[PDB]
A = this chain, B = another copy of it.
């Protein structure tokens, strides 16, 4: 049985442009939510988002190359390079076919799609960019990173809305376990904070409209929550077969021990009232890892700050973990601080789950001023928590269409 470990991590988030800076901000309870400044938001119901601060494309590639990539792709490349450099993995002629990429996005290149459609309508088909398709479609983070870094192993992109980053990591682990690859660069990226993105989620009434206090808008499980807060970013892990990593003396952050999947099969945007779908995914991941509820010290919850979603997930956690597990576990949502990073949520949060094991510290759910009644779990309100002898931690992503995933990591 081939074991899979985490050897490299990289991140751009609303609270920092590295893993280390982001983690420090999260433990400090810092929000990354700000007013949108790049377009006129007057007619929009929501005027704020978790934005990546001070991204310079020219640092990573030429302006000529960047003209060929929507920002979501630029972000994913930046995180991917970070994670690769963090891992120290050397790619050469001999191993290139054993190192691949599993990276996606939930929506892809909305800004360049908008720009292409405008060109079409204004000046006709001949004025659409020759790079329209490669610049916008969701598999092109994997595509471009593979090309840039010589990675010839399996090349995939899962695109499962909010679950995207989590699925990519899980399947990357599966492919290494199976023998298709010895290492994988995996995760997700998103930059949906565009006019059409904000308008589309707004029209669904899915976003908080707390425009007066953007940093208090994201408040998972709080009685006054009123929808999620959209954020942009990228989270990438380098995953590696254990013996390969052990054999080269690798610094190893954690082991990927469980991956579970399910579908709510309930509703397009609302989760199962009973939380059973999320429970299935958690239960499958626990079976995969061969652990019981009591062994899971921390769950980095999906917790997006929606009325229906937040409650259902707690019911599902309680089912999956059982009585004894539920008594001792900590649960928190870092979307309280970052917002909901969509295609990057699941991978950013997987990195956070790993760091909780590495540092034996659990970040808070901020803004949890007045929790709903009857939750019956410790939601780590307001401030970080030191833990002791935490050996396993779990992260959940539950996306639109009922697509659910859970990963379990083991301390290393």
Contacts and interface: CB of A to CB of B under 8 A. Distances in A.
A183 B17 CA distance: 41
Contacts of A403: 139, 142-143, 146, 155-157
B202 A150 contact: no
Contact count band on A: 35 or more
A97 interface: yes
Contact of A132 (B106, B167, B203): B203
Nearest to A178: B174
Contacts of A101: 263
Interface in A169-205: 171, 174-175, 178, 180, 195-196, 198-205
B152 A265 contact: yes
B43 A154 contact: no
A301 interface: no
Contact of A100 (B43, B45, B143, B261): B261
A144 interface: yes
A401 B155 contact: yes
B265 A195 contact: no
B161 A269 contact: no
Contacts of A155: 160, 261-263, 401-404
A132 B206 CA distance: 12
B401 A280 contact: no
A242 to B, nearest CB: 18
A131 B204 contact: yes
A199 B265 contact: no
Contacts of A268: 68, 131, 134, 140, 143-144, 147
A178 B284 CA distance: 12
Contacts of A107: 133, 137
B117 A153 contact: no
Contacts of A153: 261-263
Q: Lowest 8 A-B CB distances belong to which pairs?
A: A143-B401, A155-B263, A154-B261, A132-B200, A125-B199, A159-B159, A146-B263, A155-B403
8 contacts: A43-B124, A120-B195, A125-B198, A133-B206, A139-B161, A155-B160, A155-B403, A157-B159
